[PDB]
Write a protein that binds this ligand. Structure first.
Ligand SMILES: Nc1ncnc2c1ncn2[C@@H]1O[C@H](COP(=O)(O)OP(=O)(O)O)[C@@H](O)[C@H]1O
Ligand SMILES: Nc1ncnc2c1ncn2[C@@H]1O[C@H](COP(=O)(O)OP(=O)(O)O)[C@@H](O)[C@H]1O
Ligand SMILES: Nc1ncnc2c1ncn2[C@@H]1O[C@H](COP(=O)(O)OP(=O)(O)O)[C@@H](O)[C@H]1O
Ligand code: BEF
Ligand code: BEF
Ligand code: BEF
Ligand SMILES: [Mn+2]
Ligand SMILES: [Mn+2]
Ligand SMILES: [Mn+2]
Lengths: 437, 437, 437
DNA sequence: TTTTTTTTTTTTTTTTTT
């Protein structure tokens, strides 16, 4: 199955079910042929997990690169998150022979930006083979997994769960993973369970991977933070079947609107979440709702998110970000999306001289679109105007409340707007013009 | 006055004037007898308020449950909003001995749904006593309050107010609460006052309770968001005496019409609004219009609103919602309403496969009947037809404007209809048939 | 031309052709002299339009007040509709030095009520100068406009239009405004044109001003909603030369009759409609019928309409409305009308205790004389009698159809009467007596 | 059959990863 290493640059695909070994066996086999391999994964939990596992199961301590930890052993295999890969400047000269873009079904800005970067610097960097691996390629439907029994949940059960219920004897003893669409529910559920006599713990972006015991009975309640790549040796998985996504609406009021919505999971999500169990042994998968929506395409808001990440986290200029997204969108076999690069690039190119103090605050707060949020805060402060509203999202301005007054120079809509609004700010006019043509 | 805890399940009533302590002293006294008590209140502002107050006045940090915050201390008393109670799945097995349905005069869908839920799961959950508390029972007239002087407003005053006027020296210094029937007026009035040298602030569903200072001179302009349960230590209250309500009209054109109207407040509203002052000390109540209309009965539109909330917010099937409303309507001592359960249940049972993206948008927009609005949007999009009109209510479809064409498949009337209309859509025919018999 | 600001109160007139700048340059020049200016305009479209224009053409973001939007910048100029002015309580103490009553040729109840209010509170409010501005004073004939070529329409053309025809090449490309006497024709025409390949859109009271693009080729089909104050940068205007007006007939059968009729436009209307083009550049004006009827006087039905508006929208008692209309009728240079204040005041003074639910419904339905309509509905319901007929105007009673029976207690005639009629109701007898002397 | 303008205008509790 693994693509043979060609004598000249080449991008190939690798498709195999969840748990088959695309992230472990494959890269090992390549190393065995005397090749230097880099494996990029979107999950921090999974990346760190390869360190320990590859150690005691393949006798090879690989190099590990993540925001949390770094281990340089000098082995021929390196596991890194896409995020850490971008923050390190991308490809190194003659650093690797093969680069494996793992979980290339991920449609988060960092993975898109990362894979684009690879597809744009790989050959020049001296790599002979780039591999796009995933168990759920762009246009694919959920297929039965040999190790996973799929059992729907009913209304019987002492624990309420998205309309259905979870029977305690179903998670009393053993290792189990419960997917919840938001951190808030993860917290409540984990609590509900702990207050029952169960060893429950919650996990999501922001918490420490150590919270998950390597062994022993445990019930982990998490978000899509544990959706891909991760192996937690779970006997079962309970999926709410819902997910949080973002959409962009060009409502010209005055510019665009980025709305976060909770919707039914798509095929990719269902297969990946299900895939957290049945890894090297039989497992059970319990769900709330059957079926799902098709995949293969992602919203233009994701592109917006890439420019924002490029500007806020990876010191990439809009132009530079374009070159990378272009490589991605022009490569066959990946998720497709409306070509709005020019538009988004021209938008962000206008957002200059942002307040560093504000940017820093929205990044550390975990805000979505930290750059756009902070930029709007910047514009407001400079106009001594209040933010769109006074909710958490704009706390970085509460400190100026006594001086701020008048209408808000709305640049775009990132949430609810309560204060009066003015649409005459230069940037607003510039964005509208970027939309008119 | 407080009902004694029986040895077997029993639902009792508790009626006492506003500010007497039904939501604080009573639940404390029960806890003192070694009982676990749950207090459900419709107000988020009031619920959070019990946290701090019960702390420094009854030396007992209770558990707090609301959409905004959660505090699990482990105390024998828990304060929760009806909304948060429903979103948590309802009653917990052997979680409480007594459940107090506070402010059971509230006729909003969430309170009705909540109380029904309690009256349907309480005994089975192991509760021995359910208490229905309020200062304004179903068929009751406004009675004089010992701490409140009622002074009508006149035409003298620099601030215009619903036909009358408010004298500045009447609110210059001290703490005051001004009731306005809509957020729009709350905003204008608060502005008018701030631009006078007064510390004014507006408050309604959507803003943050923190906007109201714990102490110091302040003038709060709010909607019925601060009508019940809340204690803000106000020296006075100024009431516009008007309120926003909803009505359903079975106009068979083609189906029904839900109309929002501004009308004179009823007795319940007058006593509750008045009751925001005179809490533990003398207070003043100024009004625009005297007298009021009788209470005890609510419009069938409220039931419609419950099914819609059940479907949009609490993951309840129409059938499940019916079981809860039935418990409510069959319990003596509560507000009565036409028994249209069967009808409304059959209506919503037909509205399936709604677009999640649309539902999500109408919920976050605060639209009334978010499910019906979104469902109509769904039907339109699927027929590539435009919405009833192009006002804010249908913005979620503006994005398809270029493709939408032809007449609107009107399912029912939720507002003004400007575009041409077709009444042949399956759902429309189904609704008409639900009405014919 | 602009009246100099006197040291003591004074009401002056300002007459200048359409598009000369009475609503923009003039108020700016006053602000330049360190004066605070309020500009009242009857059009919502025009008012919002001043916001953007004054911004990028006079570098001054003015305060904007309308039902749809509010922008408080703190500038020395404020633009407001008469409607919004009345709903805010009228004049503010020492809020402005100059009040400019724009488009004082408008004979709609709101403008009349508004200007009367100003002429009655201005001095007391501390204003030094009240200005009555218009391009078409009371007794004035249509005069040639230097920027407008007037070209009659013929029978040649593919688009039928009030007896004549419109040649497609006359509106194919460019910006054009077409006046139609009713919303129904606006809809059909706009459709007819869109179904030809033209970017056509309809506009009238009720739709959103956003429907009109700021630029690009467009054909707007509208009612007198775009008759005054508005600047849409149109290359031409096509006028049907007809308008909808109302008349009152004291037919003593039993009381009066208010009839809506379609008639030939008067001079004011022709000059104002023509004035939508040729604003800052040459334009074309095409018409169906030449000439027109003289202006300067309006029907007693307008006064009736003021009391009704005062009662239904501006919380004004008949007595209060009289004080304002009196100020209007006693001020030289404005449109004159029969002095029937006493009569109309005594009529409305009798209409008390109207059903709020009905009033609310006729207001939201856009009915003319919403108060009188709703009052008649109220009387009927209280007598368990059916309405005058069963047409749209009385839909608010269809819901009682099964209980209503007998003759209709006709209070007056607002339309066709089909059901049997009784003239013995107290209110009817009271109205007749108000007419007898 | 064919057929009517213009400006004022709506609350409450559930709720978002990567
Ligand atoms: N961190 C780990 N802990 C325990 N087992 C692991 C771990 N990583 C991999 N494995 C084992 O190796 C198999 C292949 O894992 P992996 O390469 O991650 O699969 P995938 O094809 O999904 O990328 C799994 O089925 C599992 O049994
Ligand atoms: N949050 C609070 N802040 C200050 N005082 C409070 C608060 N809550 C309750 N109180 C005091 O306790 C009394 C009883 O309050 P409460 O139980 O809420 O009354 P009710 O009978 O209306 O339910 C009030 O009159 C007031 O003096
Ligand atoms: N909203 C607008 N958009 C474009 N031009 C405008 C606008 N408002 C005013 N103008 C320009 O300024 C001139 C004066 O407009 P205005 O003050 O409204 O005239 P009027 O004398 O009719 O009240 C117009 O001829 C036009 O060129
Ligand atoms: F396909 Be494996 F779950 F990364
Ligand atoms: F009766 Be209290 F005001 F809740
Ligand atoms: F006289 Be302008 F057209 F208001
Ligand atoms: Mn993998
Ligand atoms: Mn209470
Ligand atoms: Mn003008």
């Amino acid at each position: 199955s693994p693509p043979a290493v060609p004598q000249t640059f080449q991008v190939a695909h690798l498709h195999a079910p969840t748990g088959s070994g695309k992230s472990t066996k494959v890269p090992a086999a390549y190393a065995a042929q005397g090749y230097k391999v880099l494996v990029l994964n979107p999950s921090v939990a999974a990346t760190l997990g390869f360190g320990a596992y590859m150690s005691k199961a393949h006798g090879i301590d690989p190099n590990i690169r993540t925001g949390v930890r770094t281990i340089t052993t000098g082995a021929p295999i390196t596991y890194s998150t896409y995020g850490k890969f971008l923050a390190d400047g991308g490809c190194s000269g003659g650093a690797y022979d093969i680069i494996i873009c793992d979980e290339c079904h991920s449609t988060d800005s960092t993975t898109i930006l990362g894979i684009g970067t690879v597809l744009d610097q790989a050959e020049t960097a001296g790599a002979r083979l780039v591999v796009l691996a995933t168990a759920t390629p762009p246009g694919s439907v959920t297929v039965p997994h040999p190790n996973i029994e799929e059992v729907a949940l009913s209304s019987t059960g002492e624990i309420p769960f998205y309309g259905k219920a979870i029977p305690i004897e179903t998670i009393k003893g053993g290792r189990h993973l419960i997917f919840c669409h938001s951190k808030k529910k993860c917290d409540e559920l984990a609590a509900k369970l702990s207050g029952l006599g169960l060893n429950a713990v919650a996990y999501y972006r922001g918490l420490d991977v150590s919270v998950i015991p390597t062994s022993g009975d445990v019930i982990v309640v998490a978000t899509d933070a544990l959706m891909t790549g991760f192996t937690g040796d779970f006997d079962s998985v309970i999926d709410c079947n819902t997910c949080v996504t973002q959409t962009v609406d060009f409502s010209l009021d005055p510019t665009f609107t980025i709305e976060t919505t909770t919707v039914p999971q798509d095929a990719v999500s269902r297969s990946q979440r299900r895939g957290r169990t049945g890894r090297g042994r039989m497992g059970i998968y319990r769900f709330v709702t059957p079926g799902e929506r098709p995949s293969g395409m992602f919203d233009s808001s994701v592109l917006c998110e890439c420019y924002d990440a490029g500007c806020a986290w990876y010191e990439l200029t809009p132009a530079e970000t374009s070159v990378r997204l272009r490589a991605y969108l022009n490569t066959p076999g990946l998720p497709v999306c409306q070509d709005h690069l020019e538009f988004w690039e021209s938008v962000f190119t206008g957002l200059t001289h942002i307040d560093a103090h504000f940017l820093s605050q929205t990044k550390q707060a975990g805000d979505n679109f930290p750059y756009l949020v902070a930029y709007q805060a910047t514009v407001c402060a400079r106009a001594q105007a209040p933010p769109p509203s006074w909710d958490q999202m704009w706390k970085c301005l509460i400190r100026l409340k006594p001086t701020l007054h008048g209408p808000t120079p709305l640049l775009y809509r990132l949430g609810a707007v309560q204060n009066e609004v003015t649409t005459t700010h230069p940037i607003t006019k510039y964005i509208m013009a970027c939309m008119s043509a």
